[model samples]
Target: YTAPSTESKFTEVLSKAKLQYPTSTTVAFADDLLDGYAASYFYLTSDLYMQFQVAGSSQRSELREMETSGDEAAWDCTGSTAHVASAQIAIPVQEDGIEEVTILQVHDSDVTPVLRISWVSSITIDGVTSEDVVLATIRNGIDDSTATKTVLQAHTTSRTEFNINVQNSKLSITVDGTTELDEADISQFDGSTCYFKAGAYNNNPTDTSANARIKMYELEWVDHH
Candidate 1:
């Protein structure tokens, strides 16, 4: 796990900064527009195993995969509890000076039948390393009926989101307005890479053992033009 270049000094800068987020109401990307983004964000309503793969210059090839308990994953798990869990994406910003960044995550959605419902999304930056920021956390409108599952078992899931944003001084995050972390305050990752994701933080306290898979509807990154 090599640290990101800009993460070193920028981490110290995050420690002393306080920030606020504007209201996020739009879906970062629709089904057809999940392309051309180096970095992406997502909102999940169900416990579906999720992943976002990057390829080509435009993110048009954005691929989201959902895994069940039966499949094996690189990440560790005891049994049918954790299924290929990952929801964060990080891309190198062309430059660090233009730090003003905004991330959009879906907060709610309607039924799409066989397709993922994808709603009440949450987002955080760098949930794996020390340079993590809690942007938005959603906790309402969770559908737990495992009718979609073959076992007919309801899964354990809490409303959560992964988000990233820039304040006057640095980047930071907030989960359901409860868990707030500032990169500038993080000493461990003073020099880490700037990353972003839309689901599950290992330290999110709320994320213990999950029953279903984690699904990411969309992920996008925007740099100041």
Candidate 2:
């Protein structure tokens, strides 16, 4: 009875908190924003939104692995357990030609990102960059590296709802209200701890100052028993 009561109270607290990202205790950036290089920059605005940008020849910039101080674990999610992690992001389409702008990521380890969600503005890998979105998955851990797949025909930018879920050795991705990849294989994530990442990881090295910028509205991580 005590465990049940505690669980109930926890659920109630989460429901009432309605937490936002970029809060003092919920956000951090990885990569050099102060220097001109392959990196990223982040800012918490007065309007309660996290705005991040990848400037100059910066190849990647992301606010990596956010977790709460208390038991809430703000942007953190569970890997071994059945859980769903999601965010509502407002990423405007850059008029210039660029390939990918990562919006959210869930990592089983520092090197092994189980899932990565990006705005594929164009199919730059094979040809000229355009506009689209994508989700990438890495299986069997980073050190052991087994399989990797990237899908671009699913999600897009401009205030989209992106979701990634793991259950019973399978992962799924949903964009807006559409289920893009349902029941994808992710057996490698079993018994692993996971963290969340968000921001622009621009693969394009265009020397344009008006690079890509991303805004995060809401974030949620739910565990299933």
Candidate 3:
């Protein structure tokens, strides 16, 4: 669905910040550039419009416990599922020019798991650094949301620890955690060393194995508060 010269090869593979960080997240084979390519891509700085907040393990649950646990953590992890069992706090971003990037995850195990956060490198576009293109790709599922005038905000039930803010240029997405959805639009993107990652998706349900753990919480330089 992209043949306007491959939309310039998807902006020449996300305009190079070293290919925007993606070395692992289970997708091992078959990638004609992300097969079935749904949406979850990020790597823009300054043109404003950006908001993504997470941190919930309980506040919303009971779609029959997500239909007998495809496993949203079945009310355990507490707020974004307590960052996957073992919570910490480092969620705040507002880089003087206004920015917020928080990633910290820790999980023990109950089998099923899914959490992905990515923004690989900052202040270095097109020339090189994110190890070569893979921008932002988050997933946990019902197709994740936010598009059309995008500031990206849609997908929820309650909220454990959510916070996403990008001003002016035009992007908007938000959630506080257990389950309930709606809030999105991320006005494209421009520049900066914005690289990120968090994990535990398709958490192996016997097709391989089932048990999980995830950890990340390192990135902050909120200047314009």
Candidate 4:
């Protein structure tokens, strides 16, 4: 057997630095708006990063790509649990009023379900603020059954790793290669057409002085033989 070229196995990055707005079956979505405010700051410097600022408004800012309607089979990952997808991401703790930021996500295009890993600063429920970061899974686009696991207790500016093994529906999230959450269930994603997305999706309604930022150092799609 022979190994194919690495280029052939990897999906081309759809990034703001490349000025590529999800074309084909892929498209960008932000804050319930297509190509919303956060889409503007997605760019590549030494690494891919998304920066966004929304004035003193209740509206949230976010940016991510999805395969709206395309050759579904081309993006489907099912069957053997040998395949894996991973990303290296970092967030600066210096920002102000950043409520929630989803750094990486994968979801079924058909049901619009989402499995995301995020760094949450503060979520105000009934005017009470609880600062935390979490890994969340939302099945069938329903919120009532959403599951969340907290990570990064001592929050700071640092890089974290997130991975998904398709066959097992397993997820592992870590910082500096140390697993924070491991072998978590994602079985709900099985047998579904899906796609990947990464960027800063922030829920902050105050402090227009700073923007929510995220740095992505690497992204990989792997098939183990």
Candidate 5:
């Protein structure tokens, strides 16, 4: 299968969504991402998607990420700010018993993350096994300490269209054309600011053999300014 070049993928994604993102964003790639891969920061997978990965075995592991509301400064909640992003994300591979992988995040200047979204491997409850898109809402900022997990829907690492909409101090999310969050209020985060982050954040940092990956067929971030 002939996959699209990294530049081609970026071109298509950048040309759409009214071109609001890409302009104010930066791609933060882990230096070790090129350890054995091509000169490329992201590899074109056989699935024909851009795959972002991180070395779990390293002492210092950061995500190969894209962030907004960061370099351009955080958004003001009172004056109408929002972040629109969509991606078909999948953590197709996981090893070393690390079942969960963080795919996206919402953060502010404070130490906590407003939210943490992840794809957790399934567990058989009633003789049924399936993966899920888990939403962790940090009640007071993006604090891992005050975070709570809520299962919104079942999504098998295939290509499911996951959308995130943050508008007017509220947060909304949709999965496969179904509305789940419905503008949930998020103004309780000490400071009234917002920023969106995407890519792969490894969960099991201690295991170097824990191969964590997020393959994105399509990822778009648009600023509602």
Candidate 6:
């Protein structure tokens, strides 16, 4: 379990950004500070990746990436140009018990999920078990159905580069340079302060043996304005 703390490994990786660490291994949250022992929940890997891991039923790890200021989420569809974030990531897959995590996200400062992209394992398709990435947009008002978890093919454990581009109040996503979702309406969430986050954020597979890891090669801004 993450013990909580007032400092974290965020200083090593980002600027004008913060990491929302696991509560079991807590960090930097003034109100959620624990005894200062984070159990190595956040660290930089030898290969230069910002690694995030928590042992069985622990909290999570994610970089709250921002554009302008940490105090404000600085991006929105109504404000100016489109916001784009891309990452080359590797997600761990398991036989069973635990193997799912939100590797990318577009969140609001008000603590809401605008969009979440996840890599999932243990899914049986056409009677064949397969690994895939699921793109879920929180609000589905435009599609007219509760279109959560739009599954896309990712083949298997090979490292992949994905893109989440928000342009003109619409959402677009690509997996390895191929279009997955095109021009999805996100105008319903236009006014909220939005930002991007990437890492092994514990969103599912809450088992004690639940282990999830996300290796990110790059999380650079595609369209900087």
Q: Which candidate is the best by lDDT?
A: 6
Model 5: residues with Cα > 4 Å off, grouped in runs: 1-7, 12-41, 57-70, 77-79, 122-133, 142-144, 190-192, 205-208
**Candidate 6 vs. true structure, TM-score:** 0.74
In model 2, pairs of residues that clash are 120-132, 120-133, 121-130, 121-131, 122-130
Model 1 — which ten-residue stretch has the worst lDDT? 147-156
What RMSD, rounded to one decimal, does every model reach? 20.3, 9.7, 20.8, 8.4, 6.7, 5.7
Tens digit of per-residue lDDT, candidate 4, span 1-225:
111111221133322111213221223322123222233444344333333323333222333342233222234434454655576666677466666666666656554544666667654444655576554544442434545544433455666566755555655555556676666656655666565555555545356555666666665554566
lDDT of each: 0.24, 0.54, 0.22, 0.48, 0.55, 0.61
User: Weakest 10 consecutive residues, lDDT, candidate 2?
Assistant: 30-39
User: Which regions in candidate 1 have their CA more than 4 angstroms from the true location?
Assistant: 1-156, 166-169, 177-179, 186-193, 197-213
Q: By TM-score, highest first, what's the ranking? A: 6, 5, 2, 4, 1, 3
| lDDT string, candidate 1, 1-225, tens digits | 111112232122112111111112222222212221122322222222222222222121122221123221122111122121112332222122211111222222232111111211232224522122222222222343222211100112333443444323233443334324343221222222222223321212222232112233333332332
Residue 154 of candidate 6: its Cα lDDT?
62
Q: For residues 1-225, what per-residue lDDT tens digits would candidate 3 score against the true structure? A: 221112332322212111111222222111322232221222111222111222222111000111111222222222211111111122222122211122322111322112222222232334533321112232232233431211122212212233333333222223334222232222232221122123322211222221122221212211121
lDDT (Cα, tens digit) per residue for candidate 5, span 1-225: 222243454443433211111122333322222222222224667756766555453211123133322243365532365677787776575655556666767766555567767766653434555565455454554433655455667656567777888776677788777887777767666455655556566654556555666677877666776
Q: Which 10 residues in a row give candidate 5 its minimum summed lDDT?
A: 16-25
Tens-place lDDT digits, model 6, residues 1-225: 333222243322254345677652324432222233334655445555555675354256776664333353457754457788777776656425555677788876564667778666545544656555554545554335453456665645667878888877888888889888887777776676677777766655757566667766556653556
- Comparing candidate 4 with candidate 5, which one achieves the higher lDDT? 5
lDDT at residue 101 of model 3 (Cα atoms): 28
What ranges in model 6 sit over 4 Å off? Answer: 1-13, 23-39, 55-58, 67-70, 122-134, 141-147
Two-way TM-score contest, 1 vs 3, winner: 1
- The predicted structure with the larger TM-score, 1 or 2, is 2
Candidate 2 versus truth, CA RMSD in Å, comes to: 9.7
